[PDB]
């Protein structure tokens, strides 16, 4: 199940009952998120490149499930992840982050998330589990990721390159050399991940991961 708007620029896909990835193209690019429908109102992984798309992202997802979104995970201080983040603060979204996340949010001039997230944070809302995890510096210096332990869902953000994707990005804020012991800690951490949702591309597994070390080699 694929909706999406009329121009073609944000659509959205089901990976299971309540778990759906939504995507927006920007600087045009695809940048994933998900979209959590619980119980208790909608919860999203990451906003959209700018408030536009956000906005109108909102706009969709609480039309179709005809609830609110009431919290957002924003894995990393990019655009495509914060970039809707004054949306979010005039709709009463809480914006989740990590301290780090915060401080360079307002470093980049975008408004700052709530900078709440330890290294390990596990969220329940309603009846989704959702846990955040510092894995350490990779693409950027403050980037996590999200693990759905119900699904075993990894959303590994742009610390994860997709399967045909053979460029690691914009590598000037990345920390390239450390990247590598990043998804380590990951793989290390979650011993049976099933599906990894990257920043950009295709819903794919724990070889997702494999990929991106093998281009950092
Ligand atoms: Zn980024």
Redesign the pocket.
């Known amino acids: 199940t694929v909706i999406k708007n009329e121009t073609g620029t944000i659509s959205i896909s089901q990976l299971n009952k309540n778990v759906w990835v939504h995507t927006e193209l920007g600087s045009a690019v695809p940048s994933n998120g998900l979209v959590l429908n619980t119980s208790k109102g909608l919860v999203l992984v990451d906003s959209s490149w700018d408030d536009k798309l956000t906005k109108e992202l909102i706009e969709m997802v609480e039309k179709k499930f005809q609830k609110r979104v009431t919290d957002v995970i924003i894995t990393?201080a990019?655009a495509?992840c914060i970039g809707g983040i004054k949306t979010l603060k005039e709709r009463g979204i809480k914006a989740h982050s990590t301290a780090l996340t915060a401080e360079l949010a307002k470093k980049n001039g975008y408004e700052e998330p709530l900078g709440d997230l330890q290294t390990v944070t596990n969220l329940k809302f309603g009846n989704m589990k959702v846990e955040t995890f510092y894995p350490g510096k990779g693409?950027?210096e403050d980037n996590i990721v999200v693990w759905l332990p119900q699904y075993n869902i990894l959303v590994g953000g742009?610390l994860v390159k997709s399967t045909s994707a053979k460029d690691l990005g914009?590598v000037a804020d990345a920390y390239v050399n450390e990247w590598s012991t990043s998804i380590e800690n990951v793989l290390k951490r979650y011993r049976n991940i099933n599906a990894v949702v990257p920043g950009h591309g295709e819903v794919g597994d724990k070889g997702l991961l494999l990929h991106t070390l093998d281009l950092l080699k």
């Open positions: 990393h990019h495509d693409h950027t742009c914009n």
